[PDB]
């Protein structure tokens, strides 16, 4: 049943790091501007736990300077208010985030010229962060998705090279293990889960922005190309709403897109369903 869930987009980058928090309703195609982040942020990740939206890491860059963010903030849709939470052990720009058992996992990202392979876990009910096992690879601009309590970190940049590799995190054993490498090198790709596959849409391969999209079926352990998006894009927002994948904005190598595309896995098609109120990349996106 359709209960009215919305797609939230937080922060992002256009001309500088943005504060913006907006919600889109796929049912009527309307947008609603909500309370601003207390601190502008691009390259952050967004996620939802217990009906609350969380903005994680990222960075604030403008003429007033460049500062990587270790912050965690919690937005309550019911009160339309942001609340500061406990910060991570380190600033994490171009971070990847995933949720398991109501816990927020902050993966990789960077702080200055430091490229994190480290990972830490946040427990809402205790407002406390905890270091877990580090990834086998240093990854900033990594994409993250979770399927059946297993977390996947896809692609990114290790400081020297851009990766087509990916790895899986086993939360209860607290380990990481490499999985099949993608067909394409991708950093800043949109990564999400839909049914039994992890999608890796767009990204930057080191020379061009990508509009190609491939998915990893956890059952067959293979990476498969599906239909390409209309726009190439890296640093795109991505989420799933009522069985379909939605990609928001990103950079196509020329413009900061306002375009929103929707992927229908049954017909293996993407189509443009709306536009953001303004183009932007590096947003955090989540559904509730």
Q: Which residues of 190-226 are buried (b: 16+ CB within 10 A; e: fewer)?
A: bbbbbeebbbbbbbbbeeebbbbbbbbebeeeebeeb
Q: Given candidates 146, 281, 284, 285, which one binds ligand FUU under the rule CB under 6 A?
A: 281
Instruction: Name the minimum Å distance from CB 239 to ligand FUU.
Output: 15
Q: Is 282 in the site for ligand FUU (CB under 6 A)?
A: yes
Its sign, for the CA torsion 131, 114, 150, 104, is: positive
Site for ligand FUU in 213-242 (CB under 6 A): 234-235
Q: Is 176 in the site for ligand FUU (CB under 6 A)?
A: no
Q: Given candidates 26, 40, 188, 202, which one binds ligand FUU under the rule CB under 6 A?
A: 188
Q: Is 9 in the site for ligand FUU (CB under 6 A)?
A: no
Q: Is 13 in the site for ligand FUU (CB under 6 A)?
A: yes
Q: Which is nearer to ligand FUU, 91 or 141 (CB)?
A: 141
Instruction: Name the minimum Å distance from CB 47 to ligand FUU.
Output: 15
Q: Is 157 in the site for ligand FUU (CB under 6 A)?
A: yes
Q: Is 209 in the site for ligand FUU (CB under 6 A)?
A: no
Q: Which is nearer to ligand FUU, 16 or 80 (CB)?
A: 16
182: helix, strand or coil: coil
Instruction: Name the minimum Å distance from CB 263 to ligand FUU.
Output: 20
Task: Identify whether the C-beta of residue 232 lies closer than 8 Å to the C-beta of residue 263.
Answer: no
- List the end-to-end C-alpha distance of the chain, in Å, as a whole number: 14
Site for ligand FUU in 96-135 (CB under 6 A): none
Task: Identify whether the C-beta of residue 120 lies closer than 8 Å to the C-beta of residue 132.
Answer: yes
* Beta strands 72-76 and 52-56, pairing class: antiparallel
DSSP characters over 56-86: E--EEEETTEEEE---EEEEETTTTEEEE-P
- Interior angle at CA 129, CA 144 and CA 119, nearest 5: 40
Instruction: Name the minimum Å distance from CB 16 to ligand FUU.
Output: 7
d(CA 33, CA 27): 17
Q: Is 94 in the site for ligand FUU (CB under 6 A)?
A: yes
Q: Given candidates 10, 24, 42, 199, which one binds ligand FUU under the rule CB under 6 A?
A: 42
Two tokens, residue 80: 């339309």
- For ligand FUU, the binding residues (CB under 6 A) are 13, 42-43, 61, 94, 141, 157, 187-188, 204, 234-235, 281-282
């Amino acid at each position: 049943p359709k209960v009215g869930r919305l797609i939230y987009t937080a922060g992002g980058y256009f001309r500088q790091s943005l504060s913006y928090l907006e919600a889109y309703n796929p049912s009527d195609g309307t947008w609603l501007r909500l309370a601003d982040l207390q601190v502008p942020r691009s390259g952050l990740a967004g996620c939802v736990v217990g009906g609350l939206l969380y903005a994680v890491g990222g960075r604030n860059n403008s003429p007033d300077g460049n500062t990587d963010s270790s912050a965690l903030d919690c937005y309550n849709p019911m009160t339309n208010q942001w609340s500061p939470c406990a910060p991570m052990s380190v600033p994490r720009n171009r971070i990847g985030v995933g949720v398991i058992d109501g816990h927020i996992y902050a993966v990789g990202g960077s702080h200055g010229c430091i490229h994190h392979n480290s990972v830490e876990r946040y427990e809402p009910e205790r407002d406390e962060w905890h270091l877990v096992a580090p990834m086998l690879t240093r990854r900033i601009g990594v994409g993250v998705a979770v399927l059946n309590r297993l977390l996947y970190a896809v692609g990114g940049f290790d400081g020297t090279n851009r990766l087509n590799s990916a790895e899986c995190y086993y939360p209860e054993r607290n380990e990481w293990r490499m999985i099949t490498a993608m067909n394409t090198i991708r950093s800043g790709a949109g990564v999400c889960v839909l049914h039994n596959c992890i999608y890796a849409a767009g990204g930057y391969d080191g020379q061009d922005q990508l509009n190609s999209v491939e998915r990893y079926d956890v059952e067959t352990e293979t990476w498969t190309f599906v239909a390409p998006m209309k726009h190439r894009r890296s640093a795109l927002g991505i989420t799933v709403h009522q069985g379909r994948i939605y990609v928001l904005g990103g950079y196509d190598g020329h413009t900061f897109l306002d375009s929103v595309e929707c992927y229908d896995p049954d017909t293996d098609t993407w189509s443009e369903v709306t536009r953001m109120t303004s183009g932007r990349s590096g947003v955090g996106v989540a559904v509730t």
